[PDB]
């Protein structure tokens, strides 16, 4: 339970001091020196100096050892900062860190952070303008201009518009007060239609502003083989394919993402070159069984440098309650039997979602001679099909036994079968 | 003092791939046995996090994909596989002598396909111009990578020193960055020119993008 907890936000004049201060807990004091480095704007972190808190023992940097007094109170277990004549340059966070005394092991623990702005002026709120144009993307905007101190917030719409919102980090001016803009891209289309406000909120000064301001590659998301996400002992995947990739832009690009959250285990095959000039780049979703049954959304983003904007594809199994299929097999009619080859016929019905997996065999081994149907919905919801096996009517005058297959989700160990023979 | 270089500033790379971070001291930080060189972890707005101690050594609690190697001067930190927790700042420290010192930094990002910037100019309002001001604004919206570069040409005259950038973070969703540009004059200075352009350059333009509009036309 170590900390390091140092005190609040700072805004001091040129040429006043400051003193940070830095509330140690969860360790024996005495055991460590006590650190201090800042970070200016944008900047990497700079060492200032230590102090040793049992005898008060100090180390600077030369460019800080004469504005800079290092101070312990051990009854408080605080280290304290006091930097004297500010300068516009010590605007940065200061860190307390701690360091063993005992042997080196680097700055192990440090404070959160403690931001010192130098700045002449005094709080200010900012004036809102506008930002509008004088192409399918629109850009619009709000300039938030002269506020001091910081920070101010922007939301568009009242937090309805979020996405293509880009609010960006202040600039500080010549005249020591800050300014920014915040943008949304939109539809061209919209403009007619839709109204953008942008809603600014400036606590320090209690001010709230509500500003109103006035061909390609294609992707197809395949879902898996109905038989592989039912057999523990096959892999279901999901396949991404971009086609109409230019030859000027081969650039490769797939995100994936399950529930919304992005998963990093997909496998891209290399790019293929087409007969139309163009290339097809396949991207290969490995899915757990359960996660697809259990409804999850897999979706696939393209990007790509010909593309404007990133190709999103989704795709779930079908939602509604799953219905188990019935097996019905019957047999040739006498009619077929003047033919040297009979159809064996296979009706899986009243099953929900459409997804399964119909095959025919014999003796323990596949009778491949087959064809089946689509699914076909039907009044009630559910689907159906038909699957025709042929044989040879030889085959069916000697009693041999056929089976037709069905492997659907519904089913108790998602298989059933019915035989058929000649009685 | 013993000056620490990191390289390179930015490495763009992917989750899941081995991120290699390389810091050169000028002078030797090794004696009698250890390096004294320490890794940290910074994210925006957090205070760092110590990595690698003593230039090999896992701090307690730092996951096991993250080690430290090198001696002398030229050490070298390693992510075996980047978590998206690993998108951040790292640098470098020594304790050899004092002063002590850090390294640059080098920034690990998130690499994407090249993206060309979206930009639009926005001219200065009515109501900013009652005041004695004009703004005009430039955005770059959702490009990749970070470098670019923005120009302003107020009647084909390259101008500087009126003009300040700022650039949002990698997005979260995306992975691109925007940049806003503004030039700031006087409303007397606004008025003595026509033509307020905005030129820009970035990898994925074949030729620079200029945009512009014309004063009291619009
Ligand atoms: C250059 O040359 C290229 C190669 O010849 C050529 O690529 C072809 O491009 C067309 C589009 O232009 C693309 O067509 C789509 O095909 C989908 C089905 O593809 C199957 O089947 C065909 C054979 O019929 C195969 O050739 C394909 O490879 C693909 O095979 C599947 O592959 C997966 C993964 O590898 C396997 O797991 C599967 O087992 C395997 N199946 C089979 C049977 O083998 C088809 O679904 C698409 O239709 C949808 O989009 C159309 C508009 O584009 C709509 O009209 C249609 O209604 C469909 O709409 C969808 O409807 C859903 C709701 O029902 C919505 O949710 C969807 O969002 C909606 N989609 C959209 C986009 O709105 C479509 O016809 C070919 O597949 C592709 N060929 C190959 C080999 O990749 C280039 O186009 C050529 N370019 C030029 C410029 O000429
Ligand atoms: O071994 C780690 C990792 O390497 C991968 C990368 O695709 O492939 C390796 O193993 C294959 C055999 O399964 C080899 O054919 C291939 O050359 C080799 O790189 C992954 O499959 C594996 O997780
Ligand atoms: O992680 C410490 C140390 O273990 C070694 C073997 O001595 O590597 C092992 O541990 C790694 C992380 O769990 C595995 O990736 C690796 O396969 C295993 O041999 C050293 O390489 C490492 O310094
Ligand atoms: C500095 N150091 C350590 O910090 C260390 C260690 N073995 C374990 N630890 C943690 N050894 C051998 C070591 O030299």
């Known amino acids: 339970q170590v900390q390091l907890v140092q005190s609040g936000v700072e805004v001091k004049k040129p040429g006043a001091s400051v003193k940070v201060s830095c509330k140690a807990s969860?360790?024996?004091?005495?055991?460590?020196?006590m650190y201090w480095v800042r970070q200016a704007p944008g900047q990497g972190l700079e060492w200032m100096g230590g102090?040793?808190?049992?005898?008060?023992?100090?180390n600077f940097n030369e460019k800080f050892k004469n504005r800079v007094t290092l101070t312990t109170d051990s009854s408080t277990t605080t280290a304290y900062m006091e930097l004297k004549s500010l300068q516009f340059d010590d605007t940065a966070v200061y860190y307390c860190?701690?360091?063993?005394?005992?042997?080196?092991?680097?700055?192990?623990?440090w404070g959160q952070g403690t931001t010192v702005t130098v700045s002449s002026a005094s709080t200010k709120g900012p004036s809102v303008f506008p930002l509008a144009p004088c192409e399918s993307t629109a850009a619009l905007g709000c300039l938030v201009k002269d506020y001091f101190p910081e920070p101010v917030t922007v939301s568009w719409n009242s937090g309805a518009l979020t996405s293509g919102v880009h609010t960006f980090p202040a600039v500080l001016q010549s005249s020591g007060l800050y300014s920014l803009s915040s943008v949304v891209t939109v539809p061209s289309s919209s403009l007619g239609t839709k109204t953008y406000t942008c809603n600014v909120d400036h606590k320090p000064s209690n001010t709230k502003v509500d500003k109103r301001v006035e061909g390609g590659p294609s992707v197809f998301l395949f879902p898996p083989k109905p038989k592989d996400t039912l057999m523990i002992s096959r892999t279901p995947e999901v396949t991404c394919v971009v086609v109409d990739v230019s030859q000027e832009d081969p650039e490769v690009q797939f995100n994936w993402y399950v529930d919304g959250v992005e998963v990093h285990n997909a496998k891209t095959k290399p790019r293929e070159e087409q007969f139309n000039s163009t290339y097809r780049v396949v991207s290969v979703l490995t899915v757990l069984h359960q996660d697809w049954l259990n409804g999850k959304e897999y979706k696939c983003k393209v990007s790509n440098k010909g593309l404007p904007s990133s190709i999103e594809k989704t795709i779930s199994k079908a939602k509604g309650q799953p219905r188990e299929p019935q097996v019905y097999t019957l047999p040739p009619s006498q009619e077929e039997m003047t033919k040297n080859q009979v159809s064996l016929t296979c009706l899986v019905k009243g099953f929900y979602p459409s997804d399964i997996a119909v095959e025919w065999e014999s003796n323990g081994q596949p009778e491949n001679n087959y064809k089946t149907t689509p699914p076909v919905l039907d009044s009630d919801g559910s689907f159906f099909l038909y699957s025709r096996l042929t044989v040879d009517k030889s085959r069916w005058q000697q009693g041999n036994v056929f089976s037709c297959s069905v492997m659907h989700e519904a089913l108790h160990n998602h298989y059933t079968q019915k035989s058929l023979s000649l009685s | 003092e013993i000056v620490l270089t990191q390289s390179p500033a930015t490495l763009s790379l992917s989750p899941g791939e081995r991120a290699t971070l390389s810091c050169r001291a000028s002078?030797?930080?090794?004696?009698?046995?250890?390096?004294?060189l320490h890794w940290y972890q910074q994210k925006p707005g957090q205070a760092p996090r110590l990595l690698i101690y003593?230039?090999?050594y896992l701090e307690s609690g730092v996951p096991a994909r993250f080690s430290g190697s090198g001696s002398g001067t030229d050490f070298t930190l390693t992510i075996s596989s980047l978590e998206p927790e690993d998108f951040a700042v790292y640098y470098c420290?020594?304790?050899?002598?004092?002063?002590?010192?850090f390294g640059g930094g080098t920034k690990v990002e998130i690499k994407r396909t090249v993206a060309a910037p979206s930009v639009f100019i926005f001219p200065p309002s009515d109501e900013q111009l009652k005041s004695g001001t004009a703004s005009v604004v430039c955005l770059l919206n959702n490009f990749y990578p970070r470098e670019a570069k923005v120009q302003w040409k107020v009647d084909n005259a390259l101008q500087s020193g009126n003009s300040q950038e700022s650039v949002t973070e990698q997005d979260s969703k995306d992975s691109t960055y925007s940049l806003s540009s503004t030039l700031t004059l006087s409303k007397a200075d606004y008025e003595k020119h026509k033509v307020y352009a905005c030129e820009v350059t970035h990898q994925g333009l074949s030729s620079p993008v200029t945009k512009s509009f014309n004063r009291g036309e619009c």
């Open positions: 860190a701690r360091r063993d005394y005992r042997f080196d092991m680097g700055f192990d623990y």
């Open positions: 969860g360790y024996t004091f005495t055991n460590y020196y």
């Open positions: 102090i040793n808190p049992s005898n008060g023992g100090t």
């Open positions: 002078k030797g930080v090794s004696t009698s046995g250890y390096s004294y």
């Open positions: 003593l230039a090999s």
């Open positions: 420290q020594h304790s050899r002598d004092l002063p002590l010192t």
